[PDB]
Write a protein that binds this ligand. Structure first.
Ligand SMILES: Nc1ncnc2c1ncn2[C@@H]1O[C@H](COP(=O)(O)OP(=O)(O)NP(=O)(O)O)[C@@H](O)[C@H]1O
Ligand SMILES: Nc1ncnc2c1ncn2[C@@H]1O[C@H](COP(=O)(O)OP(=O)(O)NP(=O)(O)O)[C@@H](O)[C@H]1O
Ligand SMILES: CC(C)C[C@H](NC(=O)[C@@H](O)[C@@H](O)[C@@H](N)CC(N)=O)[C@@H]1Cc2cccc(O)c2C(=O)O1
Ligand SMILES: CC(C)C[C@H](NC(=O)[C@@H](O)[C@@H](O)[C@@H](N)CC(N)=O)[C@@H]1Cc2cccc(O)c2C(=O)O1
Ligand SMILES: [Cl-]
Ligand SMILES: [Cl-]
Ligand SMILES: [Cl-]
Ligand SMILES: [Cl-]
Ligand SMILES: [Cl-]
Ligand SMILES: [Mg+2]
Ligand SMILES: [Mg+2]
Ligand SMILES: [Mg+2]
Ligand SMILES: [Mg+2]
Lengths: 334, 334
C-alpha cells in the first residue's frame, strides 16, 4: 500500500460512506485485504460483491474508467471477467472528499464465481487453461478501440513504481544504472498489433478464480499497454514468487509451467518464438518494479532493521542484474 | 529484535535506571540501534561508552558473563576488543526487574577507537587486515579455559534462531526438510582444537572499527563454539549481503575478498585446504539462520503484505537449497 494513502485512510469513516452509497449496513462489509487497494466483501440482497477503495494520490476517476472500458470490451467478446456494478446513484465510481484536497474512490464489482487455486488445483491442467485464457485475452485486445482520450491507460514505461529515483535513496547509484539500462534495452523492442496492446499487466493466482476448470479474472487495476510476452512473463514471475506448491528446482518448475502454458496459449493466439529470448529481461523488470513498490510503501526513516535487511538482498539482485531463473526459454520454440 | 522483547521494553523507565547505574544524565544517552539489542552511546566526563540492553527472554546473566570471560582472554592475549566496564555498583551486568519475573540486562563497554569502514577503506588492504586479525583470534582461542560451566557458551547447533519450527509456520514442510538436511550434513564434520573452538560467530563491518589499519571488534553477543571455517564463512556472508561498495558480479567479489582474506589469515593461523569445500554449506546455513531470526522478530498475524512478499523470496531460496554464490572456493587452496 502506498504509504501516503495508508497515512490518510480512516476505515470506519469511509466504510460509513460506502453504507449509504451502496445501500448496505456496516455488518454487510467484510475486510479481505489491503495490498494496493482496500478490498472488502459486500453482501446485498442475497448476493456477494467486492468493494475496492483507493485514493487520488494513486488513481484518477478517468483512469479507472479506462479499466472499466477494457473490462466491457473483454466481456462483450466472451471472456469471463468480473464486471463493475453501479452505485445507488448510478455511478461506476463514487468520489468522497477527504477534507484535504483529495478524494477516496469507491467501486464495486461482481464476485467472481469459484475460488482461488489451491494445492489440488496446482497442476498442468491449470497451467494449460491459463495459457488458453491468456491467449484469448490477447487476441481480443487487438480489436480494442479507446472511446475517449480521457480514459487512456498508461504505457508500460510510465509506471509509477518504475520511477525508482522518486522513492529509493539517491545514493543507490548502481541500482539506478541497472534499472536505466534495462528500460533502455526494452525501449529498443518493436511494437505492433500482434506483439503489444492493452493487457492485464498483473496476472497471478490472487487475481483469478477457478470454477470447475473455468477461469474468471479480476484486479484490472494495473492494466496498461505492454508487450504480450511481458504480460506472460509477469504471470511467470508471480508463480515463481508465490508457488502454491513449493518447489526445489526453480528452473525445472519455470520450464514446465511455461511448456504447459504455451501449449494452451498457442491454441488461441500466435506469438513468435523470437519473444521467448526476452523473458529473462521482463522477469528482471518485474523485480525492479517490486523494489520501487516496496519503497513507495515504506518510510525508510521509520522502518525496522529487519525490513532493511530484506531490502538489502533485493537491492543486490538488481545491482547484479541477476537472472530470476537459469531456464533457457528459447528451448520452448515451436 | 525479538518480538517478545520489543513488546515489553519500556525505554524511558530503563534509561532512567541507567542514569544512576553508570552516572550519566538522560541527555547524554543517545540511541544508536535496535537490531538484536537496544544500543546507546553514553557520554561521561568527555569520554564515550556503549550501553547495550537486552532481556532475560533471550539472554541470561551467566551466558553474558561467558562472553565477557572470553573477551578478557582475547584482550590478555593482545587482541584489540572492546572490553566491558563495571557499573557504579561494581557489577559487569546490571539487572532491572520488568515487573513480571524477568529482567532487563544492561551492560556497558569501551567505545572502540576509530570508525566504521566506508567506500575509501573497502579494498584489498582491509580484507587482508581482516584475515590477519581473524587468524590471530582463532589462534588465541585455542588456549581459552572456561572457569565454571555456568559461563559456557553454546555449541553451533544449539542456536535459538536455527530452531525454525519454533518460529516458522508448521506448513513450510520443504523449508524444514532442507534445514534439517543441512544441519545433519554439517554434524558429520570433524572437530578438533585446530578446526573448532569458541569464535565470534557474527563478524561483519557493523561489528568492528577501523583506526588507520587497526581493527577493534565488538558485538561479542553471539559468540559460541563453531568451526573456524564457519566463522570465516559468516563474515563472507555478511560482506556479500551489505557490501560497502555494491558489486555487479557476486562470484568475482566473493573470490577476491576470500583471496585477500586468506592471504592474511594464513600468516596467523594454519587451517587445512579441505575446509574450503564447506564454505557453500556454511553460507546456506547462515541463510537458514536469518530466516529464523526474521520469524523470531515478526508476528505473521499482523505484519504487512510487503514484508510477507519479501519473506516469500527468502523462503524459496531455502526451499531450493540455492547456493549463495557460484564461486568455487576450492580454487583458493595452497
Ligand atoms: N471480482 C472479484 N471476485 C472475487 N474475489 C475478488 C474480486 N476482486 C478481488 N477479490 C478478492 O480480494 C482480493 C484482493 O483484491 P485485489 O483486486 O487483488 O486487490 P489489490 O489491492 O489490487 N491486490 P494486488 O493483487 O497485490 O494488486 C483478491 O485476492 C480476491 O481474493
Ligand atoms: N564497543 C563499541 N564501540 C563502538 N561502537 C559500538 C560498540 N558496540 C556497538 N557499537 C555501535 O553500535 C552499533 C550496534 O551495536 P551492536 O553491538 O552491533 O548491536 P546488536 O543489536 O548486537 N546488532 P547485530 O550486529 O545486528 O547483532 C554498532 O554497529 C556500532 O555502530
Ligand atoms: C504487496 C505486493 C508486493 C504483493 C504482490 N503483488 C504484486 O506484486 C503486484 O500486484 C504488484 O506488483 C502490482 N500491483 C504493481 C503494478 N504496478 O502493477 C503479490 C504478488 C502475488 C503473486 C502470486 C500470487 C499472489 O497472490 C500475489 C499477490 O497477491 O500479491
Ligand atoms: C536485523 C539483522 C538481520 C541485521 C543483520 N544482522 C545479522 O545478520 C546478525 O547480527 C545476526 O544474524 C546475528 N546476530 C544472529 C546470531 N544468532 O548470531 C545485519 C548483518 C550485517 C552484515 C554486514 C554489515 C552490517 O552492518 C550488518 C548488520 O549490522 O546487521
Ligand atoms: Cl471488516
Ligand atoms: Cl462513474
Ligand atoms: Cl500435473
Ligand atoms: Cl555482574
Ligand atoms: Cl527446527
Ligand atoms: Mg490482486
Ligand atoms: Mg491489484
Ligand atoms: Mg552488531
Ligand atoms: Mg549483535
Amino acid at each position: 500500500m502506498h504509504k501516503d494513502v495508508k497515512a490518510i485512510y480512516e476505515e470506519s469513516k469511509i466504510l460509513d460512506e460506502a453504507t449509504h452509497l451502496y445501500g448496505v449496513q456496516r455488518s454487510d462489509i467484510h475486510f479481505i485485504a489491503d495490498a494496493e487497494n482496500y478490498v472488502y466483501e459486500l453482501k446485498k440482497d442475497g448476493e456477494s460483491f467486492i468493494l475496492k477503495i483507493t485514493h487520488t494520490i494513486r488513481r484518477s476517476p478517468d483512469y479507472i474508467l479506462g479499466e472499466m472500458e477494457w473490462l466491457h470490451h473483454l466481456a462483450k467478446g466472451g471472456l469471463s471477467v468480473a464486471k463493475p456494478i453501479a452505485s445507488l446513484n448510478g455511478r461506476d465510481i463514487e468520489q468522497v472528499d477527504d477534507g484535504q484536497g483529495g478524494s477516496f474512490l469507491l467501486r464495486v464489482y461482481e464476485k467472481a464465481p469459484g475460488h482461488k487455486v489451491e494445492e489440488a488445483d496446482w497442476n498442468d491442467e491449470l497451467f494449460y487453461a491459463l495459457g488458453q485464457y491468456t491467449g484469448r485475452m490477447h487476441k481480443l485486445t487487438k480489436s480494442y478501440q479507446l472511446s475517449d482520450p480521457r480514459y487512456k491507460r498508461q504505457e508500460w514505461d510510465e509506471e509509477e513504481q518504475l520511477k525508482l529515483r522518486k522513492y529509493v535513496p539517491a545514493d543507490q547509484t548502481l541500482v539506478f544504472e541497472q534499472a536505466d539500462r534495462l528500460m533502455e534495452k526494452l525501449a529498443k523492442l518493436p511494437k505492433n498489433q500482434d506483439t503489444y496492446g492493452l493487457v492485464h499487466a498483473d496476472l497471478h493466482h490472487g487475481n483469478f478464480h477457478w470454477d470447475q476448470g473455468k477461469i474468471t479474472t479480476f484486479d484490472f487495476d494495473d492494466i496498461g499497454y505492454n508487450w504480450f510476452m511481458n504480460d506472460i512473463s509477469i504471470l511467470l514471475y508471480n508463480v515463481l514468487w508465490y508457488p502454491v506448491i513449493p518447489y526445489e528446482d526453480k528452473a525445472a518448475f519455470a520450464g514446465n509451467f511455461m511448456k504447459q502454458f504455451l501449449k494452451g496459449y498457442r491454441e488461441e493466439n500466435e506469438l513468435g518464438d523470437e519473444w521467448l529470448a526476452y523473458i529473462p529481461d521482463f522477469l528482471r523488470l518485474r523485480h525492479v518494479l517490486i523494489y520501487g513498490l516496496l519503497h513507495q510503501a515504506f518510510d525508510l526513516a521509520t522502518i525496522g532493521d529487519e525490513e532493511k535487511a530484506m531490502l538489502a538482498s533485493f537491492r543486490s539482485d538488481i545491482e547484479q542484474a541477476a537472472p530470476i531463473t537459469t531456464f533457457d526459454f528459447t528451448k520452448l520454440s515451436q
